[PDB]
Ligand SMILES: Oc1cccc(-c2[nH]c(-c3ccccc3)nc2-c2ccncc2)c1
């Protein structure tokens with residue numbers, strides 16, 4: 001087995017928009033989560049080859065990671081905040097689906113999710 005290409009992060013055929021909510025997601029949410037002590041396994045796509053997890057992409061058909069989210073944000077890939085929030089949620093869910101509950105990697109994801117939700121709660125009104 002081999003890794004799939006990473007998720008698309010740039011699409012010239014896809015309308016671009018810059019909003020205060022998207023800006024917050026990049027300059028606050030992404031930035032805060034990236035620097036968290038538990039962030040590192042989520043900073044790039046799961047390398048199933050390097051990690052010897054040959055069944056990862058047999059199970060996870062919608063991979064997502066914060067490296068991809070960073071690229072989508074800085075490329076203005078998203079039209080709205082919900083698209084980005086969905087990517088974060090997918091990342092967390094993938095971890096919970098693939099890994100046994102209570103495993104270290106799951107506990108790390110759970111804490112990151114708690115912080116994510118805390119920052120999402122303070123999402124500024126679309127002005
Ligand atoms: O063999 C295992 C068991 C559990 C986690 C890891 C695991 N290890 C790493 C990792 C990431 C960066 C550097 C070094 C290791 N990332 C993961 C991972 C696995 C599944 N989803 C997200 C991240 C490897």
Ligand SMILES: Oc1cccc(-c2[nH]c(-c3ccccc3)nc2-c2ccncc2)c1
Nearest residue numbers: 037038039102103104105106107108109111
């Ligand atoms: O039970 C838990 C809960 C959370 C993280 C870990 C956790 N597990 C590991 C780890 C690292 C290498 C091999 C096997 C496990 N590192 C951490 C960790 C803890 C705190 N800060 C950074 C990394 C274990």
